[PDB]
Design a protein around this motif. Structure first.
Motif, PDB file in Angstrom:
ATOM      1  N   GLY A   1       0.830  -1.188   0.000  1.00  0.00           N
ATOM      2  CA  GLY A   1       0.000   0.000   0.000  1.00  0.00           C
ATOM      3  C   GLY A   1       0.867   1.241   0.000  1.00  0.00           C
ATOM      4  O   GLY A   1       0.577   2.213   0.696  1.00  0.00           O
ATOM      5  N   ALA A   2       1.946   1.188  -0.774  1.00  0.00           N
ATOM      6  CA  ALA A   2       2.932   2.260  -0.839  1.00  0.00           C
ATOM      7  C   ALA A   2       3.761   2.132  -2.113  1.00  0.00           C
ATOM      8  O   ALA A   2       3.711   1.101  -2.794  1.00  0.00           O
ATOM      9  CB  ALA A   2       3.840   2.229   0.387  1.00  0.00           C
ATOM     10  N   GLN A   3       4.522   3.177  -2.429  1.00  0.00           N
ATOM     11  CA  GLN A   3       5.473   3.130  -3.538  1.00  0.00           C
ATOM     12  C   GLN A   3       6.588   2.143  -3.180  1.00  0.00           C
ATOM     13  O   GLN A   3       6.953   2.014  -2.009  1.00  0.00           O
ATOM     14  CB  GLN A   3       6.036   4.528  -3.828  1.00  0.00           C
ATOM     15  N   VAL A   4       7.109   1.430  -4.175  1.00  0.00           N
ATOM     16  CA  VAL A   4       8.183   0.466  -3.936  1.00  0.00           C
ATOM     17  C   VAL A   4       9.383   0.692  -4.842  1.00  0.00           C
ATOM     18  O   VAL A   4       9.271   1.319  -5.895  1.00  0.00           O
ATOM     19  CB  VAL A   4       7.709  -0.990  -4.146  1.00  0.00           C
ATOM     20  N   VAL A   5      10.536   0.190  -4.414  1.00  0.00           N
ATOM     21  CA  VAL A   5      11.690   0.091  -5.295  1.00  0.00           C
ATOM     22  C   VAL A   5      12.176  -1.355  -5.337  1.00  0.00           C
ATOM     23  O   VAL A   5      12.123  -2.071  -4.333  1.00  0.00           O
ATOM     24  CB  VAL A   5      12.849   1.014  -4.854  1.00  0.00           C
ATOM     25  N   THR A   6      12.617  -1.782  -6.518  1.00  0.00           N
ATOM     26  CA  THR A   6      13.226  -3.092  -6.703  1.00  0.00           C
ATOM     27  C   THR A   6      14.637  -3.083  -6.135  1.00  0.00           C
ATOM     28  O   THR A   6      15.495  -2.362  -6.622  1.00  0.00           O
ATOM     29  CB  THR A   6      13.285  -3.495  -8.203  1.00  0.00           C
ATOM     30  N   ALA A   7      14.882  -3.888  -5.110  1.00  0.00           N
ATOM     31  CA  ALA A   7      16.215  -3.986  -4.531  1.00  0.00           C
ATOM     32  C   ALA A   7      17.063  -4.930  -5.368  1.00  0.00           C
ATOM     33  O   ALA A   7      18.234  -4.657  -5.659  1.00  0.00           O
ATOM     34  CB  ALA A   7      16.145  -4.466  -3.091  1.00  0.00           C
ATOM     35  N   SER A   8      16.460  -6.045  -5.760  1.00  0.00           N
ATOM     36  CA  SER A   8      17.169  -7.039  -6.538  1.00  0.00           C
ATOM     37  C   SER A   8      16.226  -7.994  -7.255  1.00  0.00           C
ATOM     38  O   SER A   8      15.091  -8.212  -6.833  1.00  0.00           O
ATOM     39  CB  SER A   8      18.117  -7.838  -5.637  1.00  0.00           C
ATOM     40  N   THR A   9      16.711  -8.555  -8.351  1.00  0.00           N
ATOM     41  CA  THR A   9      16.098  -9.733  -8.921  1.00  0.00           C
ATOM     42  C   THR A   9      16.899 -10.897  -8.379  1.00  0.00           C
ATOM     43  O   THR A   9      18.101 -11.005  -8.628  1.00  0.00           O
ATOM     44  CB  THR A   9      16.108  -9.726 -10.453  1.00  0.00           C
ATOM     45  N   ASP A  10      16.241 -11.749  -7.608  1.00  0.00           N
ATOM     46  CA  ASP A  10      16.950 -12.781  -6.883  1.00  0.00           C
ATOM     47  C   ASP A  10      17.189 -13.960  -7.793  1.00  0.00           C
ATOM     48  O   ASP A  10      18.244 -14.592  -7.715  1.00  0.00           O
ATOM     49  CB  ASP A  10      16.173 -13.190  -5.634  1.00  0.00           C
ATOM     50  N   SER A  11      16.232 -14.237  -8.678  1.00  0.00           N
ATOM     51  CA  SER A  11      16.484 -15.209  -9.746  1.00  0.00           C
ATOM     52  C   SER A  11      15.396 -15.243 -10.807  1.00  0.00           C
ATOM     53  O   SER A  11      14.260 -14.836 -10.566  1.00  0.00           O
ATOM     54  CB  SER A  11      16.627 -16.619  -9.178  1.00  0.00           C
ATOM     55  N   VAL A  12      15.777 -15.724 -11.989  1.00  0.00           N
ATOM     56  CA  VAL A  12      14.842 -16.100 -13.035  1.00  0.00           C
ATOM     57  C   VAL A  12      15.294 -17.443 -13.610  1.00  0.00           C
ATOM     58  O   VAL A  12      16.382 -17.541 -14.178  1.00  0.00           O
ATOM     59  CB  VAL A  12      14.775 -15.053 -14.167  1.00  0.00           C
ATOM     60  N   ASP A  13      14.463 -18.469 -13.461  1.00  0.00           N
ATOM     61  CA  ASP A  13      14.755 -19.781 -14.011  1.00  0.00           C
ATOM     62  C   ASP A  13      13.890 -20.032 -15.239  1.00  0.00           C
ATOM     63  O   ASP A  13      12.648 -19.991 -15.164  1.00  0.00           O
ATOM     64  CB  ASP A  13      14.522 -20.880 -12.963  1.00  0.00           C
ATOM     65  N   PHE A  14      14.565 -20.289 -16.358  1.00  0.00           N
ATOM     66  CA  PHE A  14      13.909 -20.615 -17.620  1.00  0.00           C
ATOM     67  C   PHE A  14      13.817 -22.126 -17.731  1.00  0.00           C
ATOM     68  O   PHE A  14      14.825 -22.804 -17.941  1.00  0.00           O
ATOM     69  CB  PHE A  14      14.678 -20.033 -18.809  1.00  0.00           C
ATOM     70  N   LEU A  15      12.607 -22.645 -17.549  1.00  0.00           N
ATOM     71  CA  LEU A  15      12.392 -24.077 -17.384  1.00  0.00           C
ATOM     72  C   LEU A  15      11.895 -24.760 -18.649  1.00  0.00           C
ATOM     73  O   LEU A  15      12.240 -25.908 -18.921  1.00  0.00           O
ATOM     74  CB  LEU A  15      11.395 -24.312 -16.245  1.00  0.00           C
ATOM     75  N   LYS A  16      11.090 -24.041 -19.420  1.00  0.00           N
ATOM     76  CA  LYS A  16      10.488 -24.569 -20.634  1.00  0.00           C
ATOM     77  C   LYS A  16      10.557 -23.500 -21.705  1.00  0.00           C
ATOM     78  O   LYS A  16      10.244 -22.341 -21.442  1.00  0.00           O
ATOM     79  CB  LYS A  16       9.036 -24.974 -20.371  1.00  0.00           C
ATOM     80  N   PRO A  17      10.956 -23.881 -22.927  1.00  0.00           N
ATOM     81  CA  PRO A  17      11.045 -22.856 -23.969  1.00  0.00           C
ATOM     82  C   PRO A  17       9.674 -22.335 -24.370  1.00  0.00           C
ATOM     83  O   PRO A  17       8.711 -23.096 -24.419  1.00  0.00           O
ATOM     84  CB  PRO A  17      11.713 -23.591 -25.137  1.00  0.00           C
ATOM     85  N   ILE A  18       9.604 -21.047 -24.679  1.00  0.00           N
ATOM     86  CA  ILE A  18       8.341 -20.420 -25.006  1.00  0.00           C
ATOM     87  C   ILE A  18       8.388 -19.971 -26.454  1.00  0.00           C
ATOM     88  O   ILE A  18       9.257 -19.184 -26.840  1.00  0.00           O
ATOM     89  CB  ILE A  18       8.055 -19.201 -24.092  1.00  0.00           C
TER      90      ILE A  18
END
Lengths: 163, 166, 167, 167, 164, 164
Positions: C51-68
């Motif tokens: 319920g407030a403005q946010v900032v992205t501190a980090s992207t902790d991970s992105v796992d690519f599991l299946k091709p799109i």
């Protein structure tokens, strides 16, 4: 004959309004709104028909509230009418104020899609039924829009041929 | 009472259909077509009103013929009706075959704009008149569209009020 | 965290079709486009929850599991899986939606961390979070290990920064 | 001789408003965006004239004469001003359109060269071109000197390439 | 077969335009990550001398806010080479041109798999550092790799659980 | 006060994606020109140590068509420094990672003006080459600059003719 609820094929889209989507006055471009509307509506139509679909017409877009930079938008799309091979999709566009939890209707749109098979001819689609009051409202008001759309198709042939 | 021809504020847009404008089927995405339509129509409305405009509604978009990648499109926009403060803009979208000199009507759209002064209130616009047969056709058929658009706005209000309550 | 919200309360959706512009030379979705959408939807979920403005501190991970592939329909689901004092872990699920046989396959999975900020731009306290169903339960239950891992990685990064700063 | 076409026959228009995305930080139009629009409209004009697929051989010049601000309305006008055997010079005029005072000011001016190609990808003969009014006449009359410079620049460009291949 | 980290080192200079930003006049993260992914994919292709696919984004740390009109320099290099896989590290710097400054604005780690024409994993050359920073990224790579392997395992568990 | 051509040299590696292509799988000329303008503007800012504006695109030569999946390397440098103005040369090469080759696909020359806080023309440092290629662009620059000034005269005549 086989039927689906309006909720079964209901699609959502949450988007933040960035500077690139607006004019010099900080207002969202109508074209951008309509592009998003078309995208989400087409997906709802595919879900309902369980087949590829083509946009036959945009029946209307009403801009009710200006949309400003940094606004959070919720697009909701669902089928409100199912003809033989065709579907009316209704799209609601709401401004989601997260600081005081209000939802305001910023735009309203109706589009018509035709379901197509492998070969590309019109494919029959399942019918549709409402489960709650809002769904019931769009469903009940579908016939008026369908009649009016037919008359406007008549007028369009007159115009196309004149040209 | 001051008047303008439909030609005076007529705006053009020529665009080629590129892969980025297309779907999996090589067909142009309906959304892109509508975005370009909105763009060219707003400019036509500004020229006519000689003022800032806002889109009140998209009254319709008819997709008459599918558009393929590499097609050349011509968007033509003009005012076909001028109310007190409002304008109906008609947009023709044609496929231009340069190999065979044909133009085929691929889409047709009607939008409604409101003119606004600097303070942001509805501004009076000049009336409008046709000069050739095509302009004449759109001008003569505008009243029917205006009556139907008013009825549809009434029902739209009913729907908005209902969602406000529910 | 004494005020609470369910993971469903701030759950955000995004349905999108994969168009040629979103692809690369191989008819596959470019990872960058996927990550852009992921960032957008996750940021919205974090705003709703805080319920407030946010900032992205980090992207902790992105796992690519299946091709799109092109013509696939994607469904992005985002929700808060962990709430610290002022910070939030958001998990985003990306599923391939087959409309012809009504199946879903998980194509990608992502974890991001957000910080809530008041009007001054200072860290703002956020509500805690609780699961209601089994999937929500899964992400909630496994969140603490990911949070521990993020906290270690914050240190490693501060260091890479000083080492590069001297040299 | 050969079949001919008027400069008006293949004249293409483009009306666009300058929005924030088309701008640099300064609220001024990005030069790159302008050049993209120019190239785009110019290719279509060339296609119309040649009645065939075209390729861009060169951008002969782009002159930025007036700064372009957000909310300006632009009109791009493109026409063929010179037709060689298989090639076309296209001139693009970029004007700022002011609705409030109904006046037009020349904001940019560009010259490009296209080569027409048949289905094989071979250079195809194109129709010649002729002016009908004073403006068309001006660009037509001033075309030879520009065509000449494009040719010399082709020569020296060859020189540069050959020099770089060696080193 | 071996390659230095410098052999495949790629640069990218880009200015931050309004279209790349959020409402805050700050660069939209998604855009940053897209650029990161692009330049990293190129560095990976150069190292592998083959087509690559992104297996995972191992992390993106946002260290300093990035503003409109700022100039960014993206630097990408291979910091670890497994049998068929490559870790690419991307440094994103704010380049102050008025007085020759570089400030580290963001830091990212991604993992790529090289694929031969069959679309199967292809062997890649190993990698070695030459300067102090290259050595730094090289030496600190094992922790990141272990983290990546564990996280892939847990992702598989999650897929399994979500299937039921 | 002087700067080498290398001091302000900027790089950019980008892959050609479908969205950047026309119907023939070939990169759109406009996109190329946008990238060229961006990288050249950055080089001009570094050299001038100030804000710049694009005065003109002096030329763009398309030497090799560019296809989807190609990797492009843009190199920009200052080849001439006038009183307040700069010629920047941009080389666009196709980067083949399978055969460690570079082929020159496009070549562009642009002119920038350096601006102070208020937007008045600012003096810039001069420029000098250090190796043969830099020397080549440097030596061939004056003739191009004379051509640019003359073309400004012709443009002046054209604008005034359109005014009547």
């Amino acid at each position: 004959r086989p039927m689906k609820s309006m909720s079964e094929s209901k699609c959502y889209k949450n988007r933040q309004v960035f500077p690139q989507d607006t004019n010099h006055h900080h207002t969202m471009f109508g074209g951008t709104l309509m592009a998003n509307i078309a995208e989400i509506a087409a997906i709802t139509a595919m879900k309902h028909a369980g087949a590829q679909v083509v946009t036959a017409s945009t029946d209307s877009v009403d801009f009710l509230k200006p949309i400003k930079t940094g606004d959070i938008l919720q697009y909701v799309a669902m089928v409100s009418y199912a003809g033989t091979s065709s579907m009316e999709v209704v799209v609601q566009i709401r401004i989601d104020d997260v600081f005081n939890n209000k939802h305001d209707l910023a735009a309203l749109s109706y589009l018509t899609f035709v379901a197509l098979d492998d070969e590309g001819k019109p494919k029959h689609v399942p019918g549709v039924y409402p489960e709650d009051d809002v769904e019931k409202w769009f469903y009940d008001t579908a016939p008026q829009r369908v009649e009016r759309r037919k008359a406007r198709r008549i007028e369009s042939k007159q115009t196309i041929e004149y040209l």
